[PDB]
RNA sequence: GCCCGGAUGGUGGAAUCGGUAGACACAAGGGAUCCCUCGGCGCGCGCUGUGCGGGUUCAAGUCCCGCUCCGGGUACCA
């Protein structure tokens, strides 16, 4: 043990030891109690940034802690390797997506090894290899056989010249991000998984996930959006087809004053033939973007169809309009408007002078005031013929029933959740195992032909995908005839939905999952990833686990017992617009900034001389180039400093705006820990401790040690407030540095304390603690050392602190034997001259005593 | 727009079930890796102070009603 702490002479040594003894490689040991601690797997984007560091440090803190409690901990790592970025990056780099990705993986792997996360590298997976995606192919063909898969027309973003489909990240400020041509809606048939067949189960089972946070549970209920209502069918005067709408407010029906139909609805197309105002508005509607966001800010717009639908309870002709907020693709392409009682309908009717009819009374039973806005609150009905007078429940049921009677309405459960579109028309993904025969029939790729392998050795022109460009690739023979395979590939969420199960058995060749293995490990005891994955990934992940359950491959109902969503690590983001309108994101450390009197950024240049557009803080990521790589710091300070500082910044679940200021604190603290063990072990082996011979100064200090163990255990294991854990450990280190380490008792006691501190820091700063555990001569490798237990008999307190308030203002603090009555505390409180000062002239009207904590004398 | 979160000294944050505001740290200043000062306004004291406005309570960073700004997601970024 060198006096000075040189992490560079330590971290790599300890890292080689973990690779040689395979410390973190585990099996299905049934003699041990398992713990599966899983962190959401990285997309191999290029480099790690502090967002990954945060996520993976949290997971490793939990993994090592659980291992010290004596459990068999899987903590696996892999690469969620398909996706969009590799395509653009390939072109920009005169490469192909496959090798760019494998190098990215080689690199990030090395970065992860150098932060010393105790992964089971024997179970590493890469989702872009056929050894992986073959099973999702097979699986998807089983889903099609069970009737959970179908094809429908779906709106996509489409640069009409390049004739290529764009993701929404790629459409910008109107136009595309390549060139000056405007994106367009295009309806393209695509493959869908009926996640809506599992909607109720997904909704209901949220009430069983008592160790998931409510943020995520609510976000998911509201996303599923279950609803009971009615579907009403209308006839239309000079049109031989019916219209169907769905409403949750059948009670407001008699106030339906118009219908809206989608730009692409057949009726609007028929009408647009003879109406050039309508036709121009429909052609206008192709530029409506595919995205709830921009779809809901847009000005609401419409044209009258000229057609007139018959209200089936009043027999009153009501106009049908075409409107830019009703989409053929989601629902029946028609809605009914009740402007008196739906705010969006009010605003449309206000704009285009449509009749706004009130049919629901206010809470006190007079007619509502509709001059400024729709009345949305449920109420008694008037203006509603035979339904007048009924309350909300009643009117719902009578209108529903009348409507059923007539045979034009029906009750219906309905969800905001839509089925899951898994077709992409991009190269870099798992191919979808369907086939079209010469016939024209469609079926699954048969089993003798799985996996359908994506070729890796390609040249990419940007424009097309090479599996569509070469028409020989799609050629095959099925049922003894020429057949063509599908050249669309899977949504890369498909691979991130079952990886947690494959990590249990990654080299099993006989099928998707070794169920013995999978059931030993599952369910995941803790799942750690970003709050960004609240809905999408986490819904598909649960949906998929259920589908595997229904296939009989896993016993659990839910995949993950506890979920821990970390906050996002944020960074400023900047760009300049290039020569042909390409956005060029610049990194914060290249950006020269002049700043507000309040701290907000006012101007910004790069070194080369470009006015940057400042976009604010946002998640670190390669997309916007605002990632800070940890690699520089690790080589300056050590992995243990970077790790400690991340966990000390802020609590795991809070979103953190990254800053560099603060690392020295972490580095200096580690030098003090090092210096303390060094000075203590340099002096030799220690006497056995004599618990009950201690000075009172020693009893006090042994109490703070044991109280720290209790708090840190709770902070890591139950609260996951790592910052407070670390803070409690610093406090203690501060007292330990002031304790004289001189007689044998002091030295025995410092040994206990230090053995405990070192073990407690271990999950956070394992390289330094592995080393220090050897200088203190602890048993074996710290990686398997037992986690420390607080001795209750050391933590007994004799006295406690009471705050004395007077009308709620603190006037003193007093120590008072724990065993103290209210009468005792008043008296003592009375002795304080500053309390006395505020009791003269006045009377004690009331007294509040919170046992052992606070006295408040309420005073006139 | 809609759904979910957030805001505390120059800075990151602490206060775990409504009960001491600023633990533990970074920066800064002064002194010899160690000390010491460190919310604001005016001394071994008083007032005030948790984004803004009201409210409940003996007591509010915490709870109630109404807002601003910031971030996450919004179904083809992952
Ligand atoms: C399980 C699948 C859907 C995860 C996906 N491959 C993914 O999110 N990959 S990732 O972006 O490389 O992230 C890996 C994990 O780190 C979290 N994370 C990313 N970016 C982050 C920022 N900027 N701050 C905090 N956390 C970030 C992400 O949520 C993943 O959990
Ligand atoms: Mg602030
Ligand atoms: Zn284009």
Q: Using CA atoms, how far apart are residues A140 and A714, in angstroms rounded to an integer? A: 44
Per the structure block, which two tokens stand in for A554?
Answer: 């896993």
Helix (H), strand (E) at residue A74? strand A72-74
A136-158 exposure pattern, b = at least 16 Cβ within 10 A, e = fewer = bbbbbbebbeeebbeeeebbbbb
DSSP conformation class of A354: -
A334-343 exposure pattern, b = at least 16 Cβ within 10 A, e = fewer = bbbbbbbbbe
Task: Give the CA distances from residue A410 to residues A38, A244, A311, A689, in Å, rounded to whole numbers and listed in that order.
Answer: 46, 11, 16, 80
Ligand 1, residues A530, A545, A651, A654: which to mutate, most atoms within 8 A of Cβ?
Answer: A530
Ligand 1 mean position to A513 CA, how many Å?
Answer: 25
As beta bridge partners, residue A238 has none
Q: Using CA atoms, how far apart are residues A711 and A790, in angstroms rounded to an integer? A: 9
Atom 12 in ligand 1: which residue has the minimum CA distance? A42
Query: Is the Cβ atom of A397 within 7 Å of strand B at any atom?
Result: no
Which residue, A735, A783, A786, is CA-closest to A756? Answer: A786
Give yes or no for a contact between A83 and A125, defined as CB atoms under 8 angstroms apart: no
This structure was determined by X-ray
Which residue, A392, A377, A317, is CA-closest to A342? Answer: A377
Q: Using CA atoms, how far apart are residues A804 and A859, in angstroms rounded to an integer? A: 13
Helix (H), strand (E) at residue A525? strand A524-530
Instruction: Identify the residues numbered 174 to 203 in chain A whose C-beta atom is closer than 7 Å to any atom of strand B.
Output: 188, 190
Q: Angle at which helices A639-649 and A50-68 pack, to 10 degrees?
A: 90
Q: Give residues after which chain A gaps, C-N over 2.5 angstroms.
A: none
A598 in a known ligand binding site: no
Q: Using CA atoms, how far apart are residues A374 and A156, in angstroms rounded to an integer? A: 34
Helix, coil or strand: residue A815:
strand
Q: Using CA atoms, how far apart are residues A90 and A106, in angstroms rounded to an integer? A: 17
Specified resolution (Å): 2.5
A446 phi and psi angles, rounded to 5 deg = -70, 170
Q: Domains in chain A, ordered, with CATH?
A: 1-226+415-571 (3.40.50.620), 227-414 (3.90.740.10), 572-620 (2.20.28.290), 621-797 (1.10.730.10), 798-860 (3.10.20.590)
Helix (H), strand (E) at residue A750? helix A744-761
As beta bridge partners, residue A856 has A805, A848
* Distance between the alpha carbon (CA) of A561 and the C1' atom of B68, Å: 38
Per the structure block, which two tokens stand in for A682?
Answer: 């340099």
Give yes or no for a contact between A790 and A709, defined as CB atoms under 8 angstroms apart: yes
Q: Using CA atoms, how far apart are residues A18 and A117, in angstroms rounded to an integer? A: 10
Query: Is the Cβ atom of A536 within 7 Å of strand B at any atom?
Result: yes
A813 phi and psi angles, rounded to 5 deg = -130, 135
Residue list, ligand 1 pocket, CB within 6 Å: A 40-43, 45, 51-52, 54-55, 80, 496, 529-530, 532-533, 537, 566, 568-569, 619-621
Atom 9 in ligand 1: which residue has the minimum CA distance? A42
User: For the residues of A577-603, what is the DSSP string, one character each?
Assistant: E-TTS-EEEE-GGGEEEEE-SSS-EEE
Atom 27 in ligand 1: which residue has the minimum CA distance? A51
Q: Find out whether the peptide bond into A40 is cis, omega within 30 degrees of 0.
A: no
- In this structure, which ligand is nearest to the CA of A174? 3
Q: Using CA atoms, how far apart are residues A840 and A831, in angstroms rounded to an integer? A: 13
As beta bridge partners, residue A157 has A166, A185
């Amino acid at each position: 043990m060198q006096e000075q702490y040189r992490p560079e002479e330590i971290e790599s040594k300890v890292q080689l030891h973990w690779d040689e003894k395979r410390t973190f490689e585990v099996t299905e040991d049934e003699s041990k109690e398992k713990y599966y601690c899983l962190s959401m797997l990285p997309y191999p984007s290029g480099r790690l940034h502090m967002g990954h560091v945060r996520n993976y440090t949290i997971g490793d803190v939990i993994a090592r802690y659980q291992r010290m409690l004596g459990k068999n901990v899987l903590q696996p790592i892999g690469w969620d390797a398909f996706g969009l970025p590799a395509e653009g990056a390939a072109v920009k780099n005169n490469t192909a997506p496959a090798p760019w990705t494998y190098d990215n993986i080689a690199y990030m792997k090395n970065q992860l090894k150098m932060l010393g996360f105790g992964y089971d590298w024997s179970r590493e997976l890469a989702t872009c290899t056929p050894e992986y995606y073959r099973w999702e192919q097979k699986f998807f063909t089983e889903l099609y056989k069970k009737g959970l898969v179908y094809k429908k027309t779906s709106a996509v973003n489409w640069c009409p010249n390049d004739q290529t489909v764009l993701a929404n990240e790629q459409v910008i400020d109107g136009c595309c991000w390549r060139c000056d041509t405007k994106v367009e809606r295009k309806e393209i048939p695509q493959w869908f998984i009926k996640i809506t067949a599992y909607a109720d189960e997904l909704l209901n089972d949220l009430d069983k996930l008592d160790h998931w946070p409510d943020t995520v549970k609510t976000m998911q209920r509201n996303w599923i959006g279950r609803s009971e209502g009615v579907e009403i069918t209308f006839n239309v005067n000079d049109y031989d087809n019916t219209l169907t709408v769905y409403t949750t407010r059948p009670d407001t029906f008699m106030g339906c004053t118009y219908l809206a139909v989608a730009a692409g609805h057949p009726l609007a197309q028929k009408a647009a033939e003879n109406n050039p105002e309508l036709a121009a508005f429909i052609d206008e509607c192709r530029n409506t973007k595919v995205a709830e966001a921009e779809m809901a800010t847009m000005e609401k717009k419409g044209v009258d169809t000229g057609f007139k639908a018959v209200h089936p309870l009043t027999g009153e002709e009501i106009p049908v309009w075409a409107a830019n907020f009703v989409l053929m693709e989601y629902g029946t392409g028609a809605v009914m408007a009740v402007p008196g009682h739906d705010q969006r309908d009010y605003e449309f009717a206000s704009k285009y002078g449509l009749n706004i009819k009130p049919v629901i009374l206010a809470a006190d039973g007079s007619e509502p005031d509709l001059s400024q806005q729709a009345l949305t609150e449920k109420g008694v009905l008037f203006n509603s013929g035979e339904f007048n007078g009924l309350d909300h429940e009643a009117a719902f049921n009578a209108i529903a029933d009348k409507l059923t009677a007539m045979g034009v309405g029906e009750r219906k459960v309905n969800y905001r959740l839509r089925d899951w579109g898994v077709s992409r028309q991009r190269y870099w993904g798992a191919p979808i195992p369907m086939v079209t025969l010469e016939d024209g029939t469609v079926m699954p790729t048969p089993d003798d032909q799985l996996p359908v392998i994506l070729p890796e050795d390609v040249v990419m022109d940007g424009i097309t995908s090479p599996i569509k460009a070469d028409p020989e690739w799609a050629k095959t023979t099925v049922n003894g005839m020429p057949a063509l395979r599908e050249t669309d590939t899977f949504d890369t969420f498909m691979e991130s939905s079952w990886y947690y199960a494959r990590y249990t058995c990654p080299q099993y060749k006989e099928g998707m999952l070794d169920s013995e293995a999978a059931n030993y490990w599952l369910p995941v005891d803790i799942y750690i990833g970003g709050i960004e994955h609240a809905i999408m990934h986490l819904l598909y992940f649960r949906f998929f686990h259920k589908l595997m359950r229904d296939a009989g491959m896993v016993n659990s109902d839910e995949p993950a017992k506890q979920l821990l969503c970390q906050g996002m690590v944020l960074a400023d983001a900047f760009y300049y617009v290039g020569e042909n309108g390409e956005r060029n994101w610049v990194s914060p450390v290249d950006a020269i900034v002049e700043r507000d009197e309040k701290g907000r950024i006012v101007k910004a240049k790069d070194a080369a001389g470009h006015e940057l557009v400042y976009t604010g803080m946002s998640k670190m990521s390669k997309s916007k180039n605002n990632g800070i790589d940890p690699q520089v710091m690790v080589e300056r300070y050590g992995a243990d400093t970077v790790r400690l500082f991340m966990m000390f910044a802020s609590p795991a679940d809070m979103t953190l705006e990254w800053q560099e200021s603060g690392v020295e604190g972490a580095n200096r603290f580690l030098k003090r820990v090092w210096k303390l063990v060094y000075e203590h072990t340099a002096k030799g082996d220690v006497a056995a401790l004599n618990v009950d011979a201690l000075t009172e100064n020693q009893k006090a200090l042994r109490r703070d040690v044991h109280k720290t163990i209790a708090k840190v255990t709770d902070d890591i294991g139950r609260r996951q407030t790592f910052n407070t854990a670390i803070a409690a450990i610093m406090e203690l280190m501060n007292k330990l540095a002031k304790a004289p380490t001189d007689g044998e008792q002091d030295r025995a006691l410092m040994q206990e304390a230090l053995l405990a501190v070192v073990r407690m820091l271990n999950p956070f700063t394992p390289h330094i603690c592995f080393t220090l555990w050897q200088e203190l001569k602890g048993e074996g490798d710290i990686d398997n050392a037992p986690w420390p237990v607080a001795d209750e008999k050391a933590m007994v307190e004799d006295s406690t602190l009471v705050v004395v308030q007077v009308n709620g203002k603190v006037r003193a603090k007093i120590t008072v034997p724990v065993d103290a009555t209210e009468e005792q505390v008043r008296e003592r409180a009375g002795q304080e001259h500053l309390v006395a000062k505020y009791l003269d002239g006045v009377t004690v009207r009331k007294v509040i005593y919170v046992p052992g904590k606070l006295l408040n004398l309420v005073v006139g």
